[PDB]
Design an enzyme around this catalytic site. Structure first.
Site, mmCIF file in Angstrom:
data_model
loop_
_atom_site.group_PDB
_atom_site.id
_atom_site.type_symbol
_atom_site.label_atom_id
_atom_site.label_comp_id
_atom_site.label_asym_id
_atom_site.label_seq_id
_atom_site.Cartn_x
_atom_site.Cartn_y
_atom_site.Cartn_z
ATOM 1 N N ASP A 35 0.842 -1.187 0.000
ATOM 2 C CA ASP A 35 0.000 0.000 0.000
ATOM 3 C C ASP A 35 0.883 1.243 0.000
ATOM 4 O O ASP A 35 2.090 1.176 -0.255
ATOM 5 C CB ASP A 35 -0.932 -0.025 1.214
ATOM 6 N N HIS A 77 -4.517 6.206 2.284
ATOM 7 C CA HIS A 77 -5.053 4.938 1.790
ATOM 8 C C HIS A 77 -4.623 3.768 2.669
ATOM 9 O O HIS A 77 -5.454 2.949 3.084
ATOM 10 C CB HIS A 77 -4.604 4.730 0.341
ATOM 11 N N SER A 94 -10.746 -1.973 -2.561
ATOM 12 C CA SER A 94 -9.724 -2.246 -1.551
ATOM 13 C C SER A 94 -10.344 -2.413 -0.166
ATOM 14 O O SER A 94 -9.954 -3.310 0.590
ATOM 15 C CB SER A 94 -8.697 -1.117 -1.514
#
Ligand SMILES: [Ca+2]
Lengths: 10, 471, 92
Positions: B24, B57, B217
């Site tokens: 990530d 994120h 995700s």
């Protein structure tokens, strides 16, 4: 919804 | 009280040796949601950008997996690799090197079951899919996002990769997430859906702050958490065993498939992931299309430790010559034949330990599994030109029966006779192993299992379902 | 026998960087010698190349930064299975 993946979601 | 997404993955009756790797953006590892249970590997391979946005994120997804208040597997141990830059962007090469880093970590200092979360996508990549396949065959569990482009997931990687779990996103109405042109991917390369819109989790703005994010995700992180708990309860699970459990414990037939393009509704699993509460597992495997040659074939296959208990076919044209089961490389395979725009082969792949299975090819008042202690699990049929529990019925056609060695198994045959769609369903506690149609007035376009429901499509009509259970 | 691949989404392609994948049983020493062999043949033709990483553990091969003009040279190298142009991935 965020631009790291702007809008209201849900 | 409880965030909707965590309540939706809770079964209607409900009651750490696993590590979860994350590829990530950077992480805010000291956020109180994940502080102490996320180890930053400080592996880093990102393209240069063409600070709180930097780890937005990754921090959220680590929270969805392991967060103390809004996580799925609260307290699960995580390790992070940075492959996405501050603009959310990475490379296939960097992802390759990061996946290779995980394998080298495992070789140097082995641990238990490994679940690798891949919250990213690019176009179809031969090398990325090959690398995920090799990582999976080495025992690692890979969970990937289906992709955010309202498209066929088979066109993206690692979503299209063979032995990975690919996860699409649904919302609080169990409907597929859509945002204009954007939205969850779909198709036969998606294994299941999971809550993926309006998912509250750790915000990298501040050590205790929370934000709502949306994505495939986020959906894949729910599955990575469920898988991590499943692997803690059963650390010996193989990937095929884990995928069969994810499917079996999902909510079924809750997604309004009208959101999907017409040709993708049969190919897209109507599953929303869920934890197990506190046996014969089967799954339907769809092949790719065959093409419009009159000898064009389509092939659906099972996992190495899975048995192929039945095989059917479907053509929207209705112009098809049936299907057959045949060995290939020492493994049974489902082959379907075009008459016709093309056909799909539809395999039924099952986990049946302590069981030897075979094919018996014969014409359709005889019996097609004649050995002792053998049950008929599936009746295929194919023909060459274009116009009583252990026996297969048919008209000029050739039968391909699947007969299984299984002392603990019991199978019963249920048909339903009556039109565009006839369905017959196994009873609760029974597993659909085979689904076929019996020809009549109408022209059969095909048959396929949908969970434990046999579906026949026509243009009389009788659906035939073979249901088994371990007694 | 050796094939080339690049991503079908044109805005996601990253020309200039290539993943040279070798055949499955190739040892790490062969992977490194194949890459230096590519570097040597590229230098003779006036080209500058940079080996960014050598792969082993999952797939054998290497990551090279070079001009695409070198791809038919690189596809002829021993042990090469396929070559793929690097491409983008995105947070989903
Ligand atoms: Ca998949």
């Amino acid at each position: 919804f965020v631009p790291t993946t702007e809008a209201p979601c849900x | 009280s409880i965030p909707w997404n965590l309540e939706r993955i809770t079964p209607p009756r409900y009651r750490s040796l696993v590590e979860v790797y994350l590829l990530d953006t950077s992480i805010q590892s000291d956020h109180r949601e994940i502080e102490g249970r996320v180890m930053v590997t400080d592996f880093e391979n990102v393209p240069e950008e063409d600070a709180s946005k930097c780890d937005s994120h990754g921090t959220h997804l680590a929270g969805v997996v392991s967060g103390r208040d809004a996580g799925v597997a609260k307290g699960a141990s995580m390790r992070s690799l940075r492959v996405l830059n501050c603009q959310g962007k990475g490379t296939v090469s960097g992802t390759l090197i990061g996946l290779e880093f995980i394998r080298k970590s495992q070789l140097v200092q082995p641990v238990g079951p490994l679940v690798v979360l891949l919250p990213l996508a690019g176009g179809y990549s031969r090398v990325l899919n090959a690398a995920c396949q090799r990582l999976a065959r080495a025992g690692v569990v890979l969970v990937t996002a289906a992709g955010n482009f309202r498209d066929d997931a088979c066109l993206y990687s690692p979503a299209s990769a063979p032995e990975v779990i690919t996860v699409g996103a649904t919302n609080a109405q169990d409907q597929p997430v859509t945002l204009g042109t954007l939205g969850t991917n779909f198709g036969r390369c998606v294994d299941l859906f999971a809550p993926g819109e309006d998912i509250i989790g750790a915000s990298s703005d501040c050590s205790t702050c929370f934000v709502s994010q949306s994505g495939t995700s986020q959906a894949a992180a729910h599955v990575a958490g469920i898988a991590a708990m499943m692997l803690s309860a059963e650390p010996e699970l193989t990937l095929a065993e884990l995928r069969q459990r994810l499917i079996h414990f999902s909510a079924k037939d809750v997604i309004n498939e009208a959101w999907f393009p017409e040709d993708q509704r049969v190919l897209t699993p109507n599953l929303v992931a869920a934890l197990p509460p506190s046996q014969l597992f089967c799954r339907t495997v769809w092949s790719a299309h065959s093409g419009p040659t009159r000898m064009a074939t389509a092939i659906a296959r099972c996992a190495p430790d899975e048995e192929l208990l039945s095989c059917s076919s479907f053509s929207r044209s209705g112009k098809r010559r049936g299907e057959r089961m045949e060995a290939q490389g020492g493994k049974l395979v489902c082959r379907a034949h075009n008459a016709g725009e093309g056909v799909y082969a539809i395999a039924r792949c099952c986990l049946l330990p302590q069981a030897n299975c075979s094919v018996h090819t014969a014409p359709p008042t005889r019996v097609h599994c004649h050995q002792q202690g053998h049950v008929l699990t599936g009746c295929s049929s194919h023909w060459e030109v274009e116009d009583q529990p252990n026996q297969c019925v048919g008209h000029e056609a050739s039968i391909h029966a699947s007969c299984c060695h299984a002392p603990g198994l019991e199978c019963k045959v249920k048909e339903h006779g009556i039109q565009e769609q006839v369905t017959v369903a196994c009873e609760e506690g029974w597993t659909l192993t085979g689904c076929s149609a019996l020809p009549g007035t109408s022209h059969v376009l095909g048959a396929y299992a949908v969970d434990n429901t046999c579906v026949v499509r026509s243009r009389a009509v009788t659906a035939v379902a073979i249901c088994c259970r371990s007694r | 026998t050796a094939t080339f691949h690049r991503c079908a989404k044109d805005p996601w392609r990253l020309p200039g960087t290539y993943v040279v994948v070798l055949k499955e049983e190739t040892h790490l020493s062969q992977s490194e010698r194949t890459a230096r062999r590519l570097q040597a043949q590229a230098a003779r033709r006036g080209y500058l190349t940079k080996i960014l990483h050598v792969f082993h553990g999952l797939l054998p091969g290497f990551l090279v930064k070079m001009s695409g003009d070198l791809l038919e040279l690189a596809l002829k190298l021993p042990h090469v299975d396929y070559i793929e142009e690097d491409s983008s991935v995105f947070a989903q």
